[PDB]
Amino acid sequence: VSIGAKTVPKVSANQYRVFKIQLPDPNQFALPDRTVHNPSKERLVWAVI
Amino acid sequence: PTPVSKVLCSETYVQRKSIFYHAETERLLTIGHPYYPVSIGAKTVPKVSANQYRVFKIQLPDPNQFALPDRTVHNPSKERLVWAVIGVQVSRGQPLGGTVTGHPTFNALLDAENVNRKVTTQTTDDRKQTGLDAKQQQILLLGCTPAEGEYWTTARPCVTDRLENGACPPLELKNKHIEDGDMMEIGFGAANFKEINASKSDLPLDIQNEICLYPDYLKMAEDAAGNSMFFFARKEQVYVRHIWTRGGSEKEAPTTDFYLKNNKGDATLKIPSVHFGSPSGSLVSTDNQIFNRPYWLFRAQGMNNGIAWNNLLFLTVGDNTRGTNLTISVASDGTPLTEYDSSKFNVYHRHMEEYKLAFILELCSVEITAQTVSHLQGLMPSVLENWEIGVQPPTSSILEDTYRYIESPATKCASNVIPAKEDPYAGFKFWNIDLKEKLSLDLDQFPLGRRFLAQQGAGCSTVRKRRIS
Amino acid sequence: PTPVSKVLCSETYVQRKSIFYHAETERLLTIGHPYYPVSIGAKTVPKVSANQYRVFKIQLPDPNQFALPDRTVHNPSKERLVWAVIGVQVSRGQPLGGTVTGHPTFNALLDAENVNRKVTTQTTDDRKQTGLDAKQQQILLLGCTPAEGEYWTTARPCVTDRLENGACPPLELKNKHIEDGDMMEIGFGAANFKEINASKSDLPLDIQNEICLYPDYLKMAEDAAGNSMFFFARKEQVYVRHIWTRGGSEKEAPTTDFYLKNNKGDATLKIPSVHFGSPSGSLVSTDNQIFNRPYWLFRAQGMNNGIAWNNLLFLTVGDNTRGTNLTISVASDGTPLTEYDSSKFNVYHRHMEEYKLAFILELCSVEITAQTVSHLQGLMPSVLENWEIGVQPPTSSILEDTYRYIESPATKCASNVIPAKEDPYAGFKFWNIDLKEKLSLDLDQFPLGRRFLAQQGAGCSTVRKRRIS
Amino acid sequence: LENWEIGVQPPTSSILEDTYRYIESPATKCASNVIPAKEDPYAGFKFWNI
Amino acid sequence: ALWQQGQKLYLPPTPVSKVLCSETYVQRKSIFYHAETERLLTIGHPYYP
């Protein structure tokens, strides 16, 4: 719809709400130890459970 | 147990891990008319001068909220992690040169000259076009809280009434913090001139109507925290270059005990006798400028040796050394001029400043013992809050509304947005530099890293190009 | 010592004794007009509907002030006793059936029919008498604090002005607690319709002008305490049964890109195009209804596995399943009618709902260690007061002045009036069920006791009437 | 394999790229130049971003 | 600090009224019987006599 010079999103009950859940990169995070993966051996990621 | 009675030193409850990070900001540019904000059409042009304390808020990535791939990483409820600066290297990229400033119609009746004709009674106007070179200086500071400045203003005059319209305003000192677009000190005392120059002819046009701050070093050296400044450097030379005289009518002349009258002369002196000199900036060198020189902070001057409390840093860096204005000339018609007219070429005026920021933060875990925890109550109210140490409910646990397209007339207005916890320094504003992602862990990679390891001894690149001569 | 910053599950500082009690409320009845409060003479008739959350406040007998025949009972200053629910069995006594609701003059222009004559321009009125079956559902939830609901309302519009008189109101979500006479959700979104229906033809007459709540399950699942709900059950089926159309003038029709005009037709569409369906509840069964079924609570969904903090319980039970209205017909003269007139018999309208409540509380002693004591400060402000742990300054050591015949004029006036202290939940109101005396210790005696011991294994009566077929 | 930094000519970090303040000013160049920074791939299509 | 008045405190009385479960005084022999009624019919107008 359009009232004035603004809009009104057509929000229906029949539309695939598609979320992009953007994550916090797991590779650039604070490592307070040594057992944390070695810098060049491997990279960390996320896995949904 | 809350037996605390005296300020303590941050090293005592702060554990320093042996981890380092490199936070490099991408080069920042800003350009514009330095003297005052311009307005073409319905848009603006920030008044970007060479005499304004660029004050960066380097917002950090909260250390506490990070990925722990192990157990030796601090236990969840014992200790908290923070940031600690070790190295800072502010890089200034621009061609060296001197800063100049002037004004269309300045107020200067006469100067220090012996063979100049006799002073003509002041005409309706005596103003002239005035050149006035900046008073060269440089100020670099880092800390936790914004740096404080001092200035002079007019203090409310008392009820006692012996007042007149031309009566001299009382004065008084005032503190304030230093924001992003403040004025550097160019030759004249610091004050919100707005109430001191009612003539509009007393200042260089760029500085006028704006407040001149200064570093209240005294105040900074007194705060227990020391949050005000981790360290700091300053280099500034100046000296008189001309000597002038204001052109205002006098409400107070030198009594007859100082001024001896002459034949056919006048009983009282009428021409004003204010002699202010024009500030002069010293020649600038390739060695005098304090920049591009990594500063290793080994011990701060306060009980806080560089702890980024609140995951925040304040960089107050100002220098009129780099800056030089840039002229331009566009044809008033769009076609190269075939003949030389005084009306055809429009003179434009732009100045451009560029910075870079680099930090060598390290990880450091503060213990959370009943005693030390307590202690911070009096050191700071706020860091104990975000940290999640004491609160009614987890911020996350609470559920709050959030809309999509909050600008839609279907939805409520944006003002309601204020309910979420609000940044404290929102009233004041300054350049906001985000470093949440441009942060790494490989020292070798970056410029300031090698520069670091070099000094350390773990160097694949030692800083030595020995020159004999 | 005050170290803790995150909540601890209630089991850790709560000792469970092995004692049980049986609290059975005597059957409760209430009767009245299904739709709105009536008024005959100078008395009233509560509008008792089948679509209102009966919310009981089951006030308990303070545990910490009981009888202890032994030394084994907790030491006077180390520990405190409370109540913990284990079993709840809400019994609903009435004949099963479906709930209906209607309205004298509803707003429905036309329906989903293909052989119906063409739509006549809306006349001055198009309302008709409307039947509308209830959207069958059932909700039960026990907890410490009143359950929270959500609804839609109109949020103040902005200063920005592009307003008109018929302009649609902005909307926004709001929370509230659920009180005794609130409305169940019947087919339409939840909102204080009072500001949404300016037509009086948009709702079923019973629901209109009243607020429709809903269970904000999301909110309940987020509270650390979990006080909001120990457990809960819900069963609700619905589906469209007819499809209708409002009868209001339109401020926004489908643009020409959707609606294709026809010969001799009109440029813009004028008849409103709102298609809301009417929801009819699915057939109700003897097995679907969730009641008379003892609920053994073994682990709550929060850190509070059923602790009656503040010696208080909240039972929010609503279902439109049991309810069916009751008609009546009295002769308008008091004498049986000899002939059948349309004026002689006055139709009356009474409906009646009945409940029962049964709990299997157990005794449980919370320790009172400096640490655990402290802990509750952030869990709840109020239950500490019941404990009496907090200090109250010795100010009865200030000598105030009493007087004799404070009435005498010479004597002080004594005009000031002490103000009675408010209760925690006095602004809101709900059914108040007192259980301070109707509580016991002999499990075998009551209905829900055998039902309990049966499951336990200590049974004189095991719940088994095995049927083979 | 790219973002991860496993194989690339130079660290993105290493490059010094321009960035202005008040890029909407008329003193400064327009926002279109903003595209040079690495661009999200799904930018043509759009969806709720959480 | 001073001696004040607290609300009434409880006690457990004796109804000495426990009911008993009939199995306790009832012995069950192991004998069984089968009582079958012959089919019953009734017919008529349901609405009214």
Curated annotation (Swiss-Prot), chains B, C:
InterPro entries: Capsid_L1_Papillomavir, Capsid_L1_sf_Papillomavir, dsDNA_vir_gr_I_capsid. GO terms for molecular function: structural molecule activity. One of its GO terms (biological process) is endocytosis involved in viral entry into host cell. One of its GO terms (cellular component) is T=7 icosahedral viral capsid. The keyword Plastid does not apply. It holds the Pfam family Late_protein_L1. It comes from the Viruses. Keywords: Capsid protein, Disulfide bond, Host nucleus, Host-virus interaction, Late protein, T=7 icosahedral capsid protein, Viral attachment to host cell, Viral penetration into host cytoplasm, Virion, Virus endocytosis by host, Virus entry into host cell. It is found in: Virion; Host nucleus. Belongs to the papillomaviridae L1 protein family. Self-assembles into homopentamers. The capsid has an icosahedral symmetry and consists of 72 capsomers, with each capsomer being a pentamer of L1. Interacts with the minor capsid protein L2; this interaction is necessary for viral genome encapsidation. Interacts with protein E2; this interaction enhances E2-dependent replication and transcription activation. Forms an icosahedral capsid with a T=7 symmetry and a 50 nm diameter. The capsid is composed of 72 pentamers linked to each other by disulfide bonds and associated with L2 proteins. Binds to heparan sulfate proteoglycans on cell surface of basal layer keratinocytes to provide initial virion attachment. This binding mediates a conformational change in the virus capsid that facilitates efficient infection. The virion enters the host cell via endocytosis. During virus trafficking, L1 protein dissociates from the viral DNA and the genomic DNA is released to the host nucleus. This is Major capsid protein L1. It comes from Bovine papillomavirus type 1.
